[PDB]
Amino acid sequence: TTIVGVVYKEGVVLGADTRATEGSIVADKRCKKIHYMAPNIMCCGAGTAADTEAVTNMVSANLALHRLDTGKQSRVHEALTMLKRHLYRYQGHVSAALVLGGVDVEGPFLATVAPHGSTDRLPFVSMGSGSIAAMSALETGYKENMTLEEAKELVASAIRKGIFNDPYSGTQVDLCVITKTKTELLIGYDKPNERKYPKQEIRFPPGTTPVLREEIRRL
């Protein structure tokens, strides 16, 4: 996995690659690693998928009650804090690692949360197995008060470093853009690995496999 985030003049860009693996085999080429937290807060996840899914869901549910209760917009700091309390309690047994990004009344906010429960708010971050490669694009290319376009080009380039150099990351770039007013997912923003040799179609004429026994059931 390679997840990345940056802050730009009016908001946050999150990025991710799309390969999920079991062992050394690709189980799913087009898996979605950018998760909803709230209308104005998203999360990208690395670490153990089950743990990353359970904690994000849980905190997204608890943020939703809190908005019904208060009648106010969720603050990114509130998410960060519910996340860290939960991971702290479990002493890294719940091994979620997260990039969290959002925008609230205090402006853009971007932070990492490690599995032992430590947080770091920073203007650019990476996590996951391709974090190193990615992070080398970010330090050569980040600057202050980037425009939306520059931010998107930097995040995509950072993910592509993961895709081509880390074996546990692959396939394409997904971005998410978060601004005061909207959140915009962009699945397959960059598809640097399309097909070349169009697949040979291999056909089995029906009745190729010997059946001993058949039953039918009308629905």
Partner 1 sequence: SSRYDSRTTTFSPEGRLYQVEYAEEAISQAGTVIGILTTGGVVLGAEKGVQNSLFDSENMEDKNISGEKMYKIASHIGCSVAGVTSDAYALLNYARLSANRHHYTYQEPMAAEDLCRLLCDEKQLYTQYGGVRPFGVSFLLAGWDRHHGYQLYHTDTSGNYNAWRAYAIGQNDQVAQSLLKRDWKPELTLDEGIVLCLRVLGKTMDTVKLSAERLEVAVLHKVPAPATQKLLEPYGVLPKTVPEFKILRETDLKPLIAEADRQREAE
Partner 2 sequence: SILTYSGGSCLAMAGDGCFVIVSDNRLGEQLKTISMEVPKLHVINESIVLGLTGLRTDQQTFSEKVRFRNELYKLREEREIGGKAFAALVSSMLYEARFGPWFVEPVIASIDKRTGEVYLCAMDLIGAPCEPEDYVCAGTCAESLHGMCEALWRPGLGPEELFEVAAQAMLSACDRDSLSGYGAVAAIVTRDKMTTRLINGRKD
Partner 3 sequence: SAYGLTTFSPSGRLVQIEYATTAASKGTTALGVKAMDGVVIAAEKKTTSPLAASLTVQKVFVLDDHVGCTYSGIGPDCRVLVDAARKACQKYRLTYHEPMPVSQLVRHISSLYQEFTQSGGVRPFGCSLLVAGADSQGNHLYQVDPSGTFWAWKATSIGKGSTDAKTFLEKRYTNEMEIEDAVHTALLTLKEGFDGTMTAENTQVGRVSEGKFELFTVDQLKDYLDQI
The whole-angstrom separation of Cα 32 and Cα 136 is 24
Q: Is 210 in the site for partner 1 (CB under 8 A)?
A: no
User: Cα 43 from chain centroid?
Assistant: 6
The entry of partner 2, partner 1, partner 3, none that residue 64 binds, CB within 5 to 8 Å by partner kind: partner 3
Q: Tell me if 50 contacts partner 3 by CB under 8 A.
A: no
Query: Residue 193 corresponds to which tokens in the numbers above?
Result: 């690995």
Q: What is the DSSP letter of 10?
A: T
Classify each residue of 194-212 as buried b or exposed e, where b means 16 or more C-beta atoms within 10 Å of its C-beta: eeeeeeeeeeeeeeeeeee
- Restricting to residues 8-27, name those near partner 2 by CB under 8 A: 20, 22-23, 25, 27
Smaller CB distance to partner 2: residue 20 or 110?
Answer: 20
CA distance 101 to 41: 6
The pair of structure tokens assigned to 132 is 């190193």
Report how far apart the first and last C-alpha atoms of the chain are (Å, whole number). Answer: 43
CB of 88 to partner 2, least distance (A): 17
Q: Which of 1, 18, 52, 183 is catalytic?
A: 1
Q: Is 1 a catalytic residue?
A: yes
- Answer yes or no whether residue 196 interacts with partner 1 by CB under 8 A: no
Q: Which is nearer to partner 1, 65 or 211 (CB)?
A: 211
For partner 1, give the closer residue by CB, 22 or 215: 215
Six-digit token pair at 86? 């939960």
Q: Name the residues annotated as catalytic.
A: 1
Binding site for partner 1 (CB under 8 A): 213, 215, 217
